[PDB]
Design a protein around this ligand. Structure first.
Ligand SMILES: NC(=O)c1ccc[n+]([C@@H]2O[C@H](COP(=O)([O-])OP(=O)(O)OC[C@H]3O[C@@H](n4cnc5c(N)ncnc54)[C@H](OP(=O)(O)O)[C@@H]3O)[C@@H](O)[C@H]2O)c1
Ligand SMILES: N[C@@H](CCC(=O)O)C(=O)O
Length: 418
């Protein structure tokens, strides 16, 4: 990473609080995670040896309600990354007006080197380690990078076993399989929210998205579904995709299903027939109308900020653009959808899955789709009008929408007097 994630997040928070009336004590409260739990996760490997991994569960604030945030499994992960992600989670749930705080979990592990049984043991041991700080009304984990609904179901089963089925165990964690208390539309949640935000941004900019070009970085649960939905719902032409090993570009357009099949039959999208192999740096610099980074954070810095040529940058990923790069892009007249507003959908659907779990009653695809569209449109238009009225950057405006709400919560709890 170019710069420390938590330091960057704090810098963004201060940079944006420079445009609002907030007390010093509240700022100091908001610049520090409220609880951090570092645990050792011991599992038994396939060869019989015992290996200990490092797990983090960081909740940054729970003034507005129980904290929410996914679990990231990553070899390059650090406690600072989890702290920054929890801080961003807070604003993410505040901007779309959810009764959640901000939370984040992670394990420093390379899941590609672990078998199915080892992954299940790791998930169960992580739950056993962090049971004392999580719950349906305390902290609700969710899927994240290199984690999937499978691992979510394993974690839910372990939590239910520990909890002795005393309460709504299904609601302890979101992004679950549909058989064990899953929610319809959760699989394409973040992609649907990103597509709605892109449509609203195009509406605001007066741009017809039909026939235009979209370049997506990362081909995971968010990137692939974003490309598919953009090709299907917005009528866009997916000209380039990528994963950690590289990307494929095609001026005539790519079919996301064939690319996914190739990536599932070969391990990567590289050397896809009819496409040219490029790098992620080259993909970010392509002449496209929409650029959606859906991968690791900090991909746009002063080393490529001036080389971005997309009309709209949809930050599907968590914190993919640095504040400096934000200033450069804004100087270039490029509209940016803020990271914790563009991918609010995934956190909006998860909240829906939560409500269904705690109420014991489950909804349909149409209801979830309608509610998600309504929430995302309202949040995006609030942020847009906020940035237009005050003549400030998008990222900052969302903060003004988000942090203020969080601030209000503290003033309603007595945490800060001023
Ligand atoms: N997961 C969610 O529910 C959710 C909801 C909203 C937002 N987000 C945010 O969106 C981002 C993507 O999450 P995800 O769920 O899509 O993860 P994922 O599906 O588990 O995998 C991410 C994808 O990005 C690729 N990738 C990883 N590191 C990369 C790098 N350094 N450069 C280029 N590509 C890389 C990976 O390719 P390989 O397959 O080759 O490893 C992988 O396919 C995350 O940062 C997350 O915070 C996630
Ligand atoms: N932005 C969060 C959303 C997790 C959730 O649905 O609670 C993440 O994927 O890390």
């Amino acid at each position: 990473v170019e710069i420390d994630p938590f330091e960057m997040a704090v810098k963004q928070l201060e940079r944006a609080a420079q445009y609002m009336d907030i007390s010093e004590e509240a700022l100091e409260w908001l610049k520090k995670p409220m609880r951090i739990v570092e645990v050792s996760v011991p599992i038994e490997m396939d060869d019989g040896s015992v290996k200990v991994f490092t797990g983090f569960r960081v909740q940054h604030n729970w003034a507005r309600g129980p904290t929410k945030g996914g679990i990231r499994w990553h070899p390059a992960e650090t406690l600072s990354t989890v702290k920054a992600l929890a801080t961003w989670m807070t604003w993410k749930v505040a901007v779309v007006d959810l009764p959640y705080g901000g939370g984040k979990g992670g394990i420093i592990v390379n899941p590609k080197e672990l078998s199915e049984r080892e992954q299940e043991r790791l998930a169960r041991a992580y739950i056993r380690a962090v049971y004392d700080v999580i719950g349906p009304w305390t902290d609700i984990p969710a899927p994240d990078v290199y984690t999937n609904p499978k691992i979510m179901g394993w974690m839910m089963d372990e939590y239910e076993t520990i909890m002795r089925r005393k309460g709504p165990a299904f609601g302890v964690i979101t992004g679950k399989p549909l058989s064990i208390g899953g929610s319809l539309g959760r699989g394409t949640a973040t992609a649907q929210g990103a597509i709605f935000t892109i449509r609203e941004a195009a509406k605001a900019l007066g741009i017809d998205l039909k026939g235009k070009k979209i370049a997506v970085q990362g081909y995971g649960n968010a990137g692939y579904y974003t490309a598919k939905l953009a090709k299907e719902q917005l009528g866009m032409t997916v000209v380039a995709v990528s994963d950690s090993r590289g990307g494929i570009y095609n001026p005539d357009g790519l079919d996301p299903d064939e690319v996914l099949k190739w990536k599932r039959e070969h391990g990567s999208v590289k050397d896809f027939p009819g496409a040219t192999n490029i790098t992620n740096e080259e993909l970010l610099e392509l002449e496209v109308d929409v650029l959606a980074p859906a991968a690791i954070e900090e991909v746009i810095t002063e080393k490529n900020a001036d080389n971005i040529k997309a009309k709209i940058v949809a930050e599907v990923a968590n914190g993919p653009v640095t504040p400096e790069a934000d200033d450069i892009l804004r100087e270039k007249g490029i509209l940016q959808i803020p990271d914790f507003l563009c991918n609010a959908g995934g956190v909006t659907v998860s909240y829906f899955e939560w409500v269904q779990n705690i109420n014991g009653y489950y909804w349909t695809e149409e209801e979830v789709r309608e509610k998600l569209d309504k929430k995302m449109t309202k949040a995006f238009w609030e942020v847009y009008n906020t940035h237009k009225d005050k003549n400030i950057h998008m990222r900052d405006a969302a903060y003004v929408v988000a942090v203020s709400r969080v601030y209000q919560a503290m003033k309603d709890r007595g945490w800060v007097k001023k």
